[PDB]
């Protein structure tokens, strides 16, 4: 009953989505498309990882097919998305992870290839957005092209949903300390539009602008126009942290904030929102599958209406597991 | 007319204070005390620096005296501060920079050594605090033991004072992304009280608690009980950034915020508070002598009463230059 | 039939030795001594690791005993090694891992505490040295205090034994690119004897002197006086690499060198010496239990008598597993 | 009498060559060509540098010309090298620094643009190679297209010339610990041919192959076929170190090696080869203009015929200053 999933692009998001699908077993990958990576280089890329270690399983190439844990995978090298034969490979859902086909018209090229539904693993300008555990019940199966937002939005959402439902966020601001990105430059390099992102990633802190805090209002319509923020990109490897400063409507002591977050992390948001009281650091969340983990000891409250909350998230694994978790919920809705 | 300055401790703060005094020429160093560093090791430490480069000048040892630019410096190796003969060396002001004598009773041990006034280069529990450009006119020359707060407080004070005088800060919260220091551990190590600070500094983000935002209320009494914050220690080398989220009383567009900060950085707070509109990163402020530099392009405003302001600071040079600038103002008040 | 092992010191070597003993199950830990770490801090230290991740198992404190996987461990806080009651705790073998008791007289303090044999996890000036897979058959059970040399020696030994037995090393020089050490300073700090090791570990390359290449001649007596080398400490986290340049007596093509190393890694030196032909990097050997892994593609030969061989080693896990493997061989010799 | 120099490409080598030319004043830059960087982005790139700090001088844009220290510079955006009007701009010598036109036929496209001579700042397959201080007297002014080798070759050459002239190098091997460059990937990325260079530069050590040691035999013909080596790329920023292991013909104690290197660094190779006896680290050579600096305390000798010598070099500044120094010697030969 598991759905057939095709992956477009074998970048970081595509490789970690394939790894999450093979680790969890909720879906099955039958096809991968990349015009710039050959088969043996795909074996090398999937087998070895600097951040998450070696793959737990067997990966090899035979008869022109990538074989992972005994499952052969069709490989395409097509550059035009409308020319990829997804229907011949048996793929029903396609993950668009290259980051260059994000509009509905550009990502709709996969549907005449034989695919049924397209999931975009990036923010989209016109496709509907879904975050697991927040608004994923609003999916209604008549939508062909949807998006899964981003890692920062997936971390911030469930958290802001719990605070708003209990205390009424009047307004808020967010700052995220983010690990390096593939788009960043090892040394000062030529970035055409974003001049700050062309500077050396190993030596710098690099303020950046983001739309993840504004995208929460699309997913939670009551918070529309009430959230904004920015980001800093520090020279770490994988794990990021979200810093939210908000004004509340109802009075809330910090012990009352800790109680409702801990209760939400047990029953409704189990596996999506985490809770800890230990003295954790950033490497304690490496390969953690939670969207966000609340740090009780790191936050601070000025008074009963003005608080600052600290959350952690693995921007690689957690987000890649949410793409798989969204796809399984779509297949149960057919 | 320059005052004679003794330095207690040849750590990072003491070496950069000596370097700032020799670079600026406002004061003169006549004596250095350290019980664990010998003379030739002092020559080696002062000559070479990983962060700020080689010393611009000549440093050598002769006749048991450290000679920097032709000026001989008396060296003491005493462990008891009451036994150091500051008066025999001619030192009138003593910088207490070891970080272990911060109370008035502990830092008052230097006065029977012959010293007149003691400046503590750290926050103090009972000594009066002074930040240059904010409340340094309140010094009245009958105070023998004063403190110079900390680098984070010196960065945050100027901006806050300008914002409160023009728009009326109702309440605010601060987050600082801080570079690694000397108390942090290269690899997971045993920190007795602060368990998070014992983890590996190269691999981690490490939330920390700080009292720099609360100490602004001691320096600006109108903002008492209206500011608080925390910090993150990322694996960079020298430059930190302050992130302030505040609620204003009077309406303020972001263009009006930029105008009053730029005007304050020219006339009254010249050399203390900086202003830039370029696409800067953290390494652009290495060896910068400003206490804080306002980043106009990095901040964001949600509405006319809720803003987030970004400022930078070299926590080594700027702060060390403020210790020299405070000492010169004290000598003019005699 | 497993021996009872006591651990003196809960530093990096002691914690990874405890982790290796609980992961492998060859020995059992019954007692840990550390005068500066309390019980709950021991739980925190053993549970979380920045390099090797979270501990796979349960660790908690009850009734003053550290309980790991249901096994209670006696905790001592004694500072004098002759006062530790090893015999009351049931410990038969004691690992001296603090790095300050390395001579036979200093490490012999544990024997009137009730212990039978002492294994020093460091190079020793007068204790006999043993490297697993090279000279560990020379142990004769009448030796009470022995040493396990070091990580670099454990990496270099197996390799040089295979090359000398097949081709006759006439002379050889060595260089190791080593990851940071706890003794290194996060920022420029005061190192009393080694002035280079006091400089900032994040920003520097730092040449260092080592006696690991000379200690191979103690373990292989035919190579006495024929090996020497030095080291570089680069800002990585865990994995080091050994670079050996040697002159051979008999002619040897590089394909003949690859054949005898691959054959030795299968039969005699299985699990101690590894072999790979893939395009590996340093993070591919994180938490690898081999003493050394031969990199076939990285080495180069100038002619048939002058070659340069490249080997990898995890200086934390591999070495800690060799301490356990040495202790199990000692218990089978009783 | 200074020659007019055009620069093709505004990458790292081109920007540091322009900076070295404006700092030294031996030549003058009149023209820069880059098809992907506009004028204001050129101002931003030249003004700010993460490694070497802010530019000491004034840089601004006016009337479509880059103005540095009052000197206007013509800017071209041509992609075909044969279409660049070097003769209209007055440029006589052209530095080819893009790294893609290295053969004589490809780099000879500049000559119908009006240029007279082409200097390639890279190794070339067929152009003659020149290293300053070693074989630069062999230039005879009838050569139109020459090359300047590479940074590693420029570091190794002067050293091996001194050792061979005094002691007779029989054979030798070299290892260089190199800082990260621009071709490396911030995180695991797709490198088509060199699979190891696509792994994450921040987390890895990354063995690499180089032809710098073999290229010494082209510059010193007596050492042809007697040198080879490889490299390691560690996550530092700028400074690299060369590790040479050689067999000598004549006996040489290490004090005799230190004497001839120190004498050569004073008279003949002043400014090219350096000498130090201090306890230096890698950041002590940041922005140092020497091609190589001999580290007396870091090397080691096994016997009188088998030594290991350690040398430092700033692979950005030193090499860029040698391109300027080579061009000035060419202009004096006309």
Q: Within an 8 Å CB–CB cutoff, is residue D280 touching chain B?
A: yes
Report helix, strand or coil for D174. Answer: strand
Q: Which two three-digit tokens encode residue C19? A: 């982790």
Report helix, strand or coil for A110. Answer: helix
Chain C residues with CB-CB distance to A280 below 8 A: 48
In terms of Cα–Cα distance, which of B264, B165, B160, B139 is closest to B212? B160
3-state secondary structure labels for all residues of D175-207: EEEECCCCCCECCCCCCCCCCHHHCECCCCCCE
Cα–Cα distances in angstroms (integers) from residue D210 to residues C277, C308, D177, in the given order: 19, 14, 12
Q: Which two three-digit tokens encode residue C61? A: 């404190």
Q: Within an 8 Å CB–CB cutoff, is residue C41 touching chain A?
A: no
- Is residue B276 a known part of a binding site? no
Strand order in the sheet with D306-314: D207-209, D227-233, D169-178, D239-248, D306-314, D292-303, D273-276
End-to-end alpha carbon distance in chain A: 11
Q: Within an 8 Å CB–CB cutoff, is residue A297 touching chain C?
A: no
Cα-only R_g, chain C = 20
Sequential DSSP letters for B94-146 = EEE-SSS--SHHHHGGGGGGT-SEEEESS--SSS-B--TTTTGGG--S--SEE
Nearest to A37 among D12, D190, D204 (CB): D190
Query: How many other CB atoms are there within 10 angstroms of residue D247's CB atom?
Result: 18
Report helix, strand or coil for A138. Answer: helix
Question: At B30, phi and psi to the nearest 5?
Answer: -120, -15
- Contact, D145 vs D118, CB < 8 A? yes
Strand order in the sheet with B207-209: B207-209, B227-233, B169-178, B239-248, B306-314, B292-303, B273-276
Q: Please list the residues that pair with C208 across neighbouring strands.
A: C231
**A278 DSSP assignment:** S
Q: Within an 8 Å CB–CB cutoff, is residue A224 touching chain B?
A: no
In this complex, do D283 and B50 lie within 8 Å of one another by their Cβ atoms?
Answer: yes
CA angle C291, C294, C297 (to 5 degrees): 155
In this complex, do B50 and D279 lie within 8 Å of one another by their Cβ atoms?
Answer: no
CA angle A141, A213, A281 (to 5 degrees): 105
Q: Within an 8 Å CB–CB cutoff, is residue A125 touching chain D?
A: no
CA distance linking residue C167 with residue A158, whole number of Å? 65
Sign of the Cα pseudo-torsion (D217, D223, D226, D232, in order): negative
CA distance linking residue D4 with residue D10, whole number of Å? 17
Report helix, strand or coil for A269. Answer: coil
Structural domains in chain B plus CATH codes: 4-127 (3.40.50.720), 151-315 (3.30.360.10)
Q: Which two three-digit tokens encode residue C139? A: 């142990």
CA angle C304, C310, C311 (to 5 degrees): 135
Q: Which helix (H) or strand (E) holds D21?
A: helix D12-24
Q: Which residues, in sequence order, are CB contacts of B176 under 8 Å at separation 6+? A: B152, B155, B210, B212, B229, B231, B232, B240, B241, B242, B243
Cα–Cα distances in angstroms (integers) from residue C302 to residues A79, B16, B283, C252, C309, in the given order: 45, 50, 43, 11, 11
Q: Which residues, in sequence order, are CB contacts of B295 under 8 Å at separation 6+? A: A207, B276, B280, B310, B311, B312
Q: Within an 8 Å CB–CB cutoff, is residue A306 touching chain C?
A: no
Query: How many other CB atoms are there within 10 angstroms of residue A67's CB atom?
Result: 15
- Contact, C275 vs C261, CB < 8 A? yes
CA–CA min distance D204, chain A (Å): 8
Q: Which residues in chain A are followed by a discontinuity, with C-to-N distance exceeding 2.5 angstroms?
A: none
Secondary structure E strands in D97-140: 117-120
- Number of inter-chain CB pairs under 8 A, A vs C: 22
- Contact, D52 vs D23, CB < 8 A? no
What is the experimental method?
Answer: cryo-EM
Question: At D209, phi and psi to the nearest 5?
Answer: -100, 145
Sign of the Cα pseudo-torsion (A309, A311, A315, A321, in order): negative
Name the residue with tokens 């045993």.
B190
In this complex, do A12 and D188 lie within 8 Å of one another by their Cβ atoms?
Answer: yes
| Experimental resolution (Å) | 2.1
Query: How many other CB atoms are there within 10 angstroms of residue C25's CB atom?
Result: 10
Q: Which residues, in sequence order, are CB contacts of C287 under 8 Å at separation 6+? A: A53, C52, C314, C317
Q: Which two three-digit tokens encode residue B176? A: 């600082």
- Which residues of C make up each annotated binding site for D-glyceraldehyde 3-phosphate? 150-152, 181, 210-211, 233
Cα–Cα distances in angstroms (integers) from residue A252 to residues A159, A243, B53, C231, D132, in the given order: 15, 18, 50, 57, 72
CA dihedral C210, C213, C215, C220 (to 10 degrees): 170
Residue C312 C-alpha from the chain's centroid: 13
Packing angle of the helix pair C12-24, C39-47 (nearest 10 deg):
70
- Contact, D180 vs D237, CB < 8 A? yes
CA angle D326, D330, D333 (to 5 degrees): 145
Please identify every residue of A annotated as catalytic: 151
CA distance linking residue B208 with residue B231, whole number of Å? 5
**A200 DSSP assignment:** B
Packing angle of the helix pair C317-332, C151-167 (nearest 10 deg):
70
C320: left (phi over 0), alpha (psi -120 to 50) or beta: alpha
CA distance linking residue A46 with residue A33, whole number of Å? 14
Query: How many other CB atoms are there within 10 angstroms of residue C87's CB atom?
Result: 15
Provide the pairing of β-strand A239-248 with A169-178.
antiparallel
Q: Which two three-digit tokens encode residue C297? A: 């593609």
Q: Please list the residues that pair with C303 across neighbouring strands.
A: C306
Per DSSP, helices labelled H in A3-82 are: 12-24, 39-47
CA distance linking residue A261 with residue B121, whole number of Å? 41
- Is residue D34 a known part of a binding site? yes
Q: Which two three-digit tokens encode residue A217? A: 């209002």
Cα–Cα distances in angstroms (integers) from residue B320 to residues A178, B292, D4, in the given order: 30, 13, 45
CA distance linking residue B130 with residue B132, whole number of Å? 7
Please report the residues numbered 21 through 40 in chain C whose beta carbons come closer than 8 angstroms to any beta carbon of chain B: 36-37
Q: Which residues, in sequence order, are CB contacts of D208 under 8 Å at separation 6+? A: D178, D194, D196, D197, D230, D231, D232, D233
CA distance linking residue D76 with residue D72, whole number of Å? 13
Secondary structure E strands in chain B: 4-8, 28-33, 59-62, 65-68, 71-76, 93-96, 117-120, 145-147, 169-178, 207-209, 227-233, 239-248, 273-276, 292-303, 306-314
- Contact, D326 vs D148, CB < 8 A? yes
Query: How many other CB atoms are there within 10 angstroms of residue A35's CB atom?
Result: 12
Active site annotation includes C246: no
Question: At D107, phi and psi to the nearest 5?
Answer: -80, -10
CA distance linking residue D239 with residue D275, whole number of Å? 16
Query: How many other CB atoms are there within 10 angstroms of residue A253's CB atom?
Result: 12
Report helix, strand or coil for D44. Answer: helix
In terms of Cα–Cα distance, which of A166, A134, A162 is closest to A148? A134
Chain B residues with CB-CB distance to C48 below 8 A: 199
Q: Please list the residues that pair with D306 across neighbouring strands.
A: D247, D303
Mutate to test the interface with D, among A50, A98, A179 (most CBs of D within 10 A): A50
In terms of Cα–Cα distance, which of A137, A216, A138 is closest to A176? A216
Report helix, strand or coil for B256. Answer: helix
Cα–Cα distances in angstroms (integers) from residue A154 to residues A122, A272, A320, B24, in the given order: 11, 9, 11, 51
Nearest to A199 among D36, D50, D235 (CB): D50
Sign of the Cα pseudo-torsion (C167, C173, C177, C179, in order): positive
Q: Which of B119, B151, B242, B244 is the catalytic position?
A: B151
- Contact, C210 vs C153, CB < 8 A? no
3-state secondary structure labels for all residues of chain C: CCCEEEEECCCHHHHHHHHHHHHHCCCEEEEEECCCCCHHHHHHHHHCCCCCCCCCCCEEEECCEEEECCEEEEEECCCCHHHCCHHHHCCCEEEECCCCCCCHHHHHHHHHHCCCEEEECCCCCCCCECCCCCCHHHCCCCCCEEECCCHHHHHHHHHHHHHHHHHCEEEEEEEEEECCCCCCECCCCCCCCCCHHHCECCCCCCEEECCCCCCHHHHCHHHCCCEEEEEEECCCCCEEEEEEEEEECCCCCHHHHHHHHHHHHHCCCCCCEEEECCCCCHHHHCCCCCCEEEEEEEEEEEECCEEEEEEEEECCHHHHHHHHHHHHHHHHCC
In terms of Cα–Cα distance, which of C165, C313, C311 is closest to C250? C165
**A250 DSSP assignment:** S
End-to-end alpha carbon distance in chain D: 11
CA distance linking residue B143 with residue C198, whole number of Å? 38
Chain B residues with CB-CB distance to D280 below 8 A: 48
- Is residue A13 a known part of a binding site? yes
- Contact, B123 vs B215, CB < 8 A? yes
- Contact, C234 vs B234, CB < 8 A? no
Residue of C nearest to D232 (CA): C177
Q: Which two three-digit tokens encode residue C223? A: 């190579």
Residue C3 C-alpha from the chain's centroid: 20
CA distance linking residue A96 with residue A106, whole number of Å? 10
Q: Which of D151, D212, D273, D330 is the catalytic position?
A: D151
- Contact, C90 vs C178, CB < 8 A? no
Name the residue with tokens 């990502």.
A107
In terms of Cα–Cα distance, which of D245, D220, D233, D94 is closest to D149? D220
Q: Please list the residues that pair with B68 across neighbouring strands.
A: B59, B71
Q: Which two three-digit tokens encode residue C284? A: 């591919």
In terms of Cα–Cα distance, which of D182, A186, A308, C48 is closest to B203? C48
End-to-end alpha carbon distance in chain C: 11
Sign of the Cα pseudo-torsion (B219, B222, B224, B226, in order): negative
CA distance linking residue A175 with residue A180, whole number of Å? 16
End-to-end alpha carbon distance in chain B: 11
Mutate to test the interface with D, among C201, C210, C226, C279 (most CBs of D within 10 A): C279
Provide the pairing of β-strand D292-303 with D4-8.
unpaired
CA–CA min distance B284, chain A (Å): 9
Question: At C154, phi and psi to the nearest 5?
Answer: -65, -30
Q: Which residues, in sequence order, are CB contacts of A275 under 8 Å at separation 6+? A: A261, A262, A265, A293, A294, A296
CA distance linking residue C73 with residue C14, whole number of Å? 14
- Contact, B175 vs B181, CB < 8 A? no
Nearest to B286 among D53, D283, D284 (CB): D53
Report helix, strand or coil for B308. Answer: strand
Residue of A nearest to D235 (CA): A202
Query: How many other CB atoms are there within 10 angstroms of residue A125's CB atom?
Result: 8
- Is residue D121 a known part of a binding site? yes
Mutate to test the interface with A, among C40, C42, C48, C52 (most CBs of A within 10 A): C48
**D82 DSSP assignment:** G
Chain C residues with CB-CB distance to A53 below 8 A: 286-287
CA distance linking residue D274 with residue D271, whole number of Å? 7
In this complex, do B45 and C235 lie within 8 Å of one another by their Cβ atoms?
Answer: no
Chain A residues with CB-CB distance to C236 below 8 A: none
CA distance linking residue A178 with residue B144, whole number of Å? 46
CA distance linking residue D302 with residue B194, whole number of Å? 48
Cα–Cα distances in angstroms (integers) from residue B133 to residues A159, B147, B263, B290, C247, in the given order: 41, 15, 15, 11, 69
Strand order in the sheet with A306-314: A207-209, A227-233, A169-178, A239-248, A306-314, A292-303, A273-276
Chain C residues with CB-CB distance to D200 below 8 A: 283
In terms of Cα–Cα distance, which of D159, D179, D126 is closest to D285? D179
D94: left (phi over 0), alpha (psi -120 to 50) or beta: beta
């Amino acid at each position: 009953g598991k759905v057939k999933v095709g992956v477009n692009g074998f970048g970081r998001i595509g490789r970690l989505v394939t790894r999450a699908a093979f680790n969890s077993g909720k879906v099955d990958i039958v096809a991968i498309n990349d015009p710039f990576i050959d088969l043996n280089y795909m074996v090398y890329m999937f087998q070895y990882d600097s951040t998450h270690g070696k793959f737990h399983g067997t990966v090899k190439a035979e008869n022109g097919k990538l074989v992972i844990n005994g499952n052969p995978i069709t490989i395409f090298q097509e550059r035009d998305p409308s020319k990829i034969k997804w229907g011949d490979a048996g793929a029903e859902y396609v993950v668009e992870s290259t980051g260059v086909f994000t509009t509905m018209e550009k990502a709709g090229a996969h549907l005449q290839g034989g695919a049924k539904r397209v999931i975009i693993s990036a923010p989209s300008a016109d496709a509907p957005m879904f975050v697991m555990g927040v608004n994923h019940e609003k999916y209604d199966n008549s939508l062909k092209i949807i998006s899964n937002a981003s890692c920062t939005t997936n971390c911030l959402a469930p958290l802001a949903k719990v605070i708003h439902d209990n205390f009424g966020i009047v307004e808020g601001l967010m700052t995220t300390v983010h690990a390096i990105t593939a788009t960043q430059k090892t040394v000062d390099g030529p970035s055409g539009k974003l001049w700050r992102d062309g500077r050396g990633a190993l030596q710098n802190i690099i303020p950046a602008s983001t739309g993840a805090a504004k995208a929460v209002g699309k997913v939670i319509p009551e918070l529309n126009g009430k959230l904004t923020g920015m980001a800093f990109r520090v020279p770490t490897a994988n794990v990021s942290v979200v810093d939210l400063t908000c004004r509340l409507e109802k009075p809330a002591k910090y012990d009352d904030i800790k109680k409702v977050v801990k209760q939400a992390s047990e029953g409704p948001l189990k596996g999506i929102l985490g809770y800890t009281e230990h003295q954790v650091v950033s490497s304690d969340f490496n390969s953690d599958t939670h969207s966000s983990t609340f740090d009780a000891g790191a936050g601070i409250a000025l008074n009963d209406h003005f608080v600052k909350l600290i959350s952690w998230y693995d921007n690689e694994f957690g987000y890649s597991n949410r793409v798989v978790d969204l796809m399984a919920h779509m297949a149960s809705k057919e």
